[PDB]
Amino acid sequence: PKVGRLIYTAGGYFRQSLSYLEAYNPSDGTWLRLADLQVPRSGLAGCVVGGLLYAVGGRNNSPDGNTDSSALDCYNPMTNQWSPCAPMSVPRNRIGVGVIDGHIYAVGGSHGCIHHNSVERYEPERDEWHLVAPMLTRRIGVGVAVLNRLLYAVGGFDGTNRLNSAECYYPERNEWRMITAMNTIRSGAGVCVLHNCIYAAGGYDGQDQLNSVERYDVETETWTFVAPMKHRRSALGITVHQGRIYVLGGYDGHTFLDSVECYDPDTDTWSEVTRMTSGRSGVGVAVT
User: Fold this and answer.
1) Which domains does the chain show, CATH number per domain?
2) Which of 136, 168, 238, 250 is the most buried (most CB within 10 A)?
3) Where S-cGMP-cysteine occurs, residue numbers?
4) What is the C-alpha to C-alpha distance for residues 84 and 167, in angstroms, rounded to an integer?
């Protein structure tokens, strides 16, 4: 059943880090502006747990300085209010996040020149972070998705090398394992899950911004290309709404995009469905 869920986009970057929170309704094509983040943020990740939107990590980059963020803030759509939560152990710009069993996992990212392999877990009921097992690889500009209580960390930059590698976290055992590498090197890709596949859309391969899209089928253990996006983009937002993938904004090597594209796996096609109210990259996105 279609019940009126919306795509939320928080923060982002255009000329400086942004404070915007806006919601898109794919049913009628409208955008609604909501309460601003208290502190501007770009390079953050968004997620939803128990009806609440969380904005995790990122950075505030502007003429008033460049500072990485360890912040966790939570937005309640029912009250249109933001609330601070406990901060992470370390700042994490260009972080990846995923949710397992009602907990938020914060993965990788950077603090100054430090490229984290560390991972930590937030428990909303206790408003507490706890360190878990680190990744095998340091990854900033990493993408994360969860399928059947396993968490995948995909691509990124380790401080020296830009990565086509990916790895999987097994939460009950608290361990990481490398999986099949992607066909393409990608930092700053959009990573999500749809059906039995983990998608990696766009990103930066060290030369160009990418419009290619590939997916890892967790059963057959292959990465296969699907149809490419209309626009090359890195530092895009990505999410899934009613069985389709949406990509929001990003940087194409020239412009900070307002384009939103939508992927239908049944026809293997992308279409432009709307424009954001202003172009931006480095947003956190989620659906509730």
Assistant:
1) 1-288 (2.120.10.80)
2) 250
3) 113
4) 31
